From Swiss-Prot, chains A, C:
This is Endonuclease GajA. Component of antiviral defense system Gabija type I, composed of GajA and GajB. Has no detected ATPase activity. Expression of Gabija type I in B.subtilis (strain BEST7003) confers resistance to phages phi105, phi29, rho14, SpBeta and SBSphiC. Expression of Gabija type I in E.coli B (strain ATCC 11303) confers resistance to phage T7. It comes from Bacillus cereus (strain VD045). ATP binds at D32, I33, G34, K35, T36. The N-terminal ATPase-like domain seems to have lost ATPase activity, but may still bind nucleotides. The C-terminal Toprim (topoisomerase/primase) domain probably has the endonuclease activity, but when expressed alone (residues 348-578) has not activity, showing it requires the N-terminal ATPase-like domain for function. Disruption phenotype: When this gene is missing the Gabija type I system does not confer resistance to SpBeta in B.subtilis. The chain holds residues 1 to 156 of 578 of the full protein. It comes from the Bacteria. Homotetramer. Forms the core of the anti-phage defense complex. Interacts with GajB; 2 GajB dimers dock at opposite sides of the GajA complex to form a 4:4 GajA-GajB assembly (GajAB). GajAB interacts with Bacillus phage Phi3T Gad1 protein; this interaction forms a 4:4:8 GajAB-Gad1 complex and leads to GajAB inhibition. The record marks K94, R97 as: Interaction with GajB.
Swiss-Prot record, chain B:
Homodimer. Interacts with GajA; 2 GajB dimers dock at opposite sides of the GajA complex to form a 4:4 GajA-GajB assembly (GajAB). GajAB interacts with Bacillus phage Phi3T Gad1 protein; this interaction forms a 4:4:8 GajAB-Gad1 complex and leads to GajAB inhibition. Residues 6-234 form the UvrD-like helicase ATP-binding domain. The record marks V152, Q155 as: Interaction with GajA. Disruption phenotype: When this gene is missing the Gabija type I system does not confer resistance to SpBeta in B.subtilis. When this gene is missing the Gabija type I system does not confer resistance to T7 in E.coli. Keywords: Antiviral defense, ATP-binding, Helicase, Host-virus interaction, Hydrolase, Nucleotide-binding. This is Gabija protein GajB. Contains a UvrD-like helicase domain. The keyword ATP-binding applies. It comes from Bacillus cereus (strain VD045). It comes from the Bacteria. InterPro entries: DNA_helicase_UvrD/REP, P-loop_NTPase, UvrD-like_ATP-bd, UvrD-like_helicase_C. Belongs to the helicase family. One of its GO terms (biological process) is recombinational repair.
């Protein structure tokens, strides 16, 4: 029902940033690169049309190329018996959960550079536990998270 | 209009739990896919449905009539439904992590008969099999225990599936019944149960007919309907489905002119009755399936050589010894079609064995039936079919039926060819026309039947095959006079239009 | 070592075309749309950067959208004990072959429209048998066929 | 690399691809009953005597029985490092 926090562990200018979230989030500040990189991190996690291009050399901090990019998003998943989007997630997640952690869900993105074909591959995992996250299944160009979420990007 | 359309209008516009008591065949797949299409059209939410059968041939037929969808619907057998939706995703949660996920369903060598040793086998050597007694289900009991023991299985199976469509409830195990009313009662899922009551049940040995006979008399929370699949398609043709010989003569409506019947002159030959109706009258179509149901096989072959001199080359398959009423025709017909054709796939043979979903083990029986590809006409058929029926279960449904199967390939051919490919212009007799439906039925007057006041059920079941057009001629003047006497007996002035 | 034939069972203007191939293939003729669609079918089969966009409504014949797109390519695999690219294919294909068909290999592409999200998904299969083709395994944005092949497109 | 990709080819289609390596309960001590277990109840374990290996014997038999296992294991691996 409600988002919890996003941990960005490596991106274009993020070292290790743990931002608590909610519904209806508003970001502001002085530097515009960090705000547009926050929105691009959300787009890389949730939008298929941006995720399919992968990462370049410039999407790592200091162009260091030897560090794994990790982006983790946490949900609450607790407010059931009245909410509709809870069922919308549970019906597609299927058996990736445990009955002990009926609440709190994790969606994660990992990336490591290849350094020979010059390409950073993006691998998506999900699960209700901090470790033992399994890969999101998908047939062709799509996976189950594309069936769950619909992202609308509005820019003038 | 009548019972077919008003039952369709009632059943399609329902929203509750539905119980349909239909007849024998007549397109249960049609009403099933029509209700499925209506329910998927009226719904705009994220929920999906689950269609449940026994044979996956019906599943590919259902998705062929349906088309393609990415909503997440499940079409298949109940074994696959229980395996992939309840057992496999939640076996590691319901019974601890020490129970294994990745497992193989094999019910060909297993005959253990307790729950305790069953889940000992599932924990230690991770094979799920079957019970020893035929009227049990280890898989459905395990699914019920998983659903009652695991929370997240209940959350998933409530948050995904909206309606569940059950077919062939007349032959269903009581554990399937327990799981289905557990899904109906606590988790609040809607159910669409179809079937027929009693009337010579078969398939999935161990049937328990009191299951379907438990929700006809005493059940209350179910919208009940009779047969909704029509005896005949279209509207005007259905009139002679209400003809019979008595009682249902009162149930038929009055019409001043029936458009679906064409009567013609009787002096000239049929071989250009067809040419007059197809070309001059533009009534019949050669490219549509064009079938005359007649009897008296000698005059049938006379009509055959007459029509080969006509040119369109009608084909005759007579009453095979395989065509008698037996509980095992549908699979050994696939065995003989795979053996004697040459190129029929082994998965086409795999599509009918009880609960199917059989991977990795089709070669075990294809070795046996590849040993059946030797001609060896004397005595090898008995022991190879014996070890086949030991392999494929449904045992001791033979002795008379093994001889009925034997007389097919005796003399190496029963009719030199068989129903191999798709060809038009077929002829069937009354002993073998039951089951397969014909687009255009052109009986040709049912020679010397009506004025004798007998042979009436034969031309009645000849007229049961027609969809859009049927023709009845007064081949004799006294035939027309007895038609007039019969329509005085109906108290209905016109039931047949003559052009 | 050597290509055998390509069967295109549905594309932008191909109904059912079975073209025998070889190494060093040269195509010519009068209509340029068919030749550039032949080259685009080869690019959709073998190039990752074109396959990732999927099919549109206009990539089906007559925009009919109810027909499955099938593109199958056949190889020879017979000339062993002297060839290097044979090892280059066997080292990645792993256990997708049978010892009965030690020669001849199949790479196939299938597509079917969604009609609700307006997107044609592309699914790749391979195997040494005409039936029972299994899906090509892959972790993220790539699969094993990207490790096998390297496609260079030259256009002035 | 040897057992799972080529078990269905080396010993016929009736042998399963799916299997689970468990060596805490198995103490059977013959090859014949071992592949009877691997065919019927599809568990690969260990031998009873400690100085044996059922898995490596099955790998050697699969390599000697299947052509494509030899082609794969020759066309992929160049050097093998034993510690």
């Amino acid at each position: 029902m409600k988002f919890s926090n996003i941990t960005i562990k490596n991106f274009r200018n993020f070292e290790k940033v743990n931002i608590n979230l909610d519904n209806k989030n508003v970001i502001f500040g002085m530097n515009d690169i960090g705000k547009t990189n926050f929105l691009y991190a959300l787009r890389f996690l949730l939008d298929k049309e941006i995720r399919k291009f992968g990462f370049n050399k410039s999407d790592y901090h200091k162009h260091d190329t030897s560090k794994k990019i990790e982006i983790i998003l946490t949900l609450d998943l607790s407010n059931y018996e009245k909410d509709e989007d809870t069922k919308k997630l549970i019906s597609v997640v299927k058996g990736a959960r445990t009955s002990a952690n009926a609440d709190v869900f994790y969606i994660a993105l990992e990336s490591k550079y290849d350094d020979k074909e010059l390409y950073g591959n993006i691998i998506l995992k999900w699960g209700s536990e901090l470790d033992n996250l399994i890969d999101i299944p998908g047939r062709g160009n799509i996976n189950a998270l594309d069936n769950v979420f619909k992202v609308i990007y509005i820019n003038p | 209009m009548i019972e077919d359309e008003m039952s369709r209008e009632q059943i399609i516009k329902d929203g509750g739990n539905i119980l349909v008591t239909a007849g024998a065949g007549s397109g249960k797949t049609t009403i099933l896919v029509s209700k499925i299409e209506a329910d998927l059209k009226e719904n705009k939410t994220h929920y999906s449905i689950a269609a449940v059968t026994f044979t996956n041939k019906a599943a590919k037929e259902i998705e062929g009539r349906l088309g393609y969808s990415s909503r997440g619907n499940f079409i298949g057998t109940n074994d696959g439904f229980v395996e992939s939706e309840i057992i496999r995703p939640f076996i590691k949660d319901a019974f601890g992590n020490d129970y294994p996920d990745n497992f193989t369903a094999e019910y060909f060598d297993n005959q253990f008969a307790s729950y305790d040793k069953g889940l000992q086998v599932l924990k230690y050597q991770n094979i799920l099999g079957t019970y020893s007694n035929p009227k049990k289900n280890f898989k459905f009991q395990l699914a019920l225990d998983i659903l009652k023991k695991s929370l997240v299985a209940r959350q998933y199976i409530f948050s995904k599936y909206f309606k569940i469509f059950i077919d062939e409830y007349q032959d269903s195990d009581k554990d399937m019944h327990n799981l289905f009313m557990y899904l109906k009662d606590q988790l609040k899922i809607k159910l669409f149960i179809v079937g027929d009551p009693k009337q010579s049940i078969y398939i999935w040995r161990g049937a328990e007919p009191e299951n379907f006979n438990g929700l006809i008399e005493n059940s209350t929370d179910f919208n009940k309907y009779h047969l909704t699949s029509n005896f005949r398609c279209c509207q005007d043709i259905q009139n002679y489905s209400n003809l019979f010989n008595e009682e249902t003569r009162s149930l038929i409506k009055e019409k001043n002119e029936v458009q679906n019947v064409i009567s013609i002159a009787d002096d000239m030959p049929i071989s250009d009755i067809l040419l007059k109706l197809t070309e001059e009258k533009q009534v019949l179509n050669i490219e549509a399936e064009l079938v005359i149901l007649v009897r008296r096989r000698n005059q049938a072959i006379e009509i055959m050589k007459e029509l080969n001199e006509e040119g369109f080359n009608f084909i005759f398959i007579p009453q095979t010894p395989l065509d008698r009423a037996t509980p095992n025709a549908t699979l050994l017909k696939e065995v003989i079609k795979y053996v004697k054709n040459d190129r029929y796939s082994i998965y086409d043979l795999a599509a009918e064995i009880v609960g199917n979903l059989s991977s990795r083990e089709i070669k075990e029986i294809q070795k046996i039936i590849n040993e059946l590809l030797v001609p060896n006409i004397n005595q090898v058929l008995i022991n190879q079919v014996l070890i086949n029926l030991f392999a494929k279960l449904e045992i001791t449904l033979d002795t008379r039926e093994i001889t009925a199967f034997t007389e097919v390939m005796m003399t190496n051919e029963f009719d030199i060819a068989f129903d191999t490919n798709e060809y038009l212009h077929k002829i069937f007799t009354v002993h073998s026309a039951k089951g397969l439906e014909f687009n255009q039925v052109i009986i040709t007057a049912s020679d010397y039947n009506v004025h004798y006041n007998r042979d009436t059920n034969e031309h009645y079941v000849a007229t049961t095959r027609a969809k859009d057009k049927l023709i009845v001629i007064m081949d004799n003047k006294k035939y027309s006079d007895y038609i007039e006497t019969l329509m005085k007996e109906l108290k209905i002035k016109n039931i047949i239009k003559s052009i």
